A = this chain, B = another copy of it.
Amino acid sequence: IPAFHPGELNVYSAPGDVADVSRALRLTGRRVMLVPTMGALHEGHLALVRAAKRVPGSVVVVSIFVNPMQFGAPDDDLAQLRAEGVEIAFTPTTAAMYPDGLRTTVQPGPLAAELEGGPRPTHFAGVLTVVLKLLQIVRPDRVFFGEKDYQQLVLIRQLVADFNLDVAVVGVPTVREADGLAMSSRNRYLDPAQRAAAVALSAALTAAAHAATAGAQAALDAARAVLDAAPGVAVDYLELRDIGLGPMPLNGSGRLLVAARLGTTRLLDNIAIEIGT
């Protein structure tokens, strides 16, 4: 077995090493928690880590991996994890994840072609493939995903249900700046004027959530009005759906999702909506 030093950060890049260490740790009764990331860590990611660490005795495994895009489509990350009490960082190369190339893959259901999948019809196949691999390597009791990527979260629940995966999927609420802006690595691409304008997405959604006492159309129209008031924001979609991303029912709980471009940067956000309250 690879060396593992409890109560310290241990970094592995070979899938077999993490699989061996995780197996040994689980046999001692320590539950294993998995937090998938693409690195470039910020407080939103740290919320997922802290949620994992709340589970007593947990070994928190944070993976850092950027999946290659399919056809036609020095940092302080480890220091941050060390300071959070993370004991395993898994940092595989593309070659380690795909030693035989892109061969067997996961084909998501039709939700993957909607919303974020409109612009990127192969994106969620890639996400679900990588998540499935991470789940099998680490064999966590629970895996943590942010509500900010709500469609991703829903698709991961579909993956887990459809393939009978013995893992609990935990959605963690979106961590926001003081003005409401959803934290995201991509926010670093925004210049100061764009960062100021970007508050429109959260302002729109929160407006809608409160407008919703007057019904679904009022909610949608309120959000659209806020977005239309922000000149440098080009909306890609603004959609109200049920909580599983099916059609919104006449009365009940739903989710309002928005994606918009500010210059070259595409931002996304979403919020709970209640109708027929």
- Chain B residues contacting A165 (CB-CB under 8 Å) are 136
Give the number of copies in the complex: 2
Contact status of A104 and B100, CB under 8 A, knowing A164-B15, A166-B136, A166-B139: no
- Chain B residues contacting A23 (CB-CB under 8 Å) are 166
Tell me the nearest residue of chain B to A159, going by C-beta: B104
A166 partner, pick from B19, B107, B166, beta carbons under 8 A: B19
Contact status of A162 and B19, CB under 8 A, knowing A106-B107, A107-B106, A107-B107: no
Spell out A's residues near B (CB within 8 Å): 15, 19, 23, 99-100, 103-110, 125, 128, 132-133, 136-137, 139, 158-159, 161-166
Contact status of A164 and B100, CB under 8 A, knowing A105-B107, A106-B106: no
- Chain B residues contacting A108 (CB-CB under 8 Å) are 103-104
Q: Is the CB of A128 within 8 A of B107?
A: no
- Chain B residues contacting A159 (CB-CB under 8 Å) are 104
- Chain B residues contacting A19 (CB-CB under 8 Å) are 164, 166
Contact status of A104 and B106, CB under 8 A, knowing A136-B166, A139-B166, A165-B136: yes
CA distance A128 to B103 in the complex (A): 13
| Among all A-B residue pairs, the 6 with the closest Cβ atoms | A103-B109, A104-B162, A136-B164, A107-B107, A137-B164, A105-B107
Tell me the nearest residue of chain B to A104, going by C-beta: B162
Q: Is the CB of A164 within 8 A of B133?
A: yes
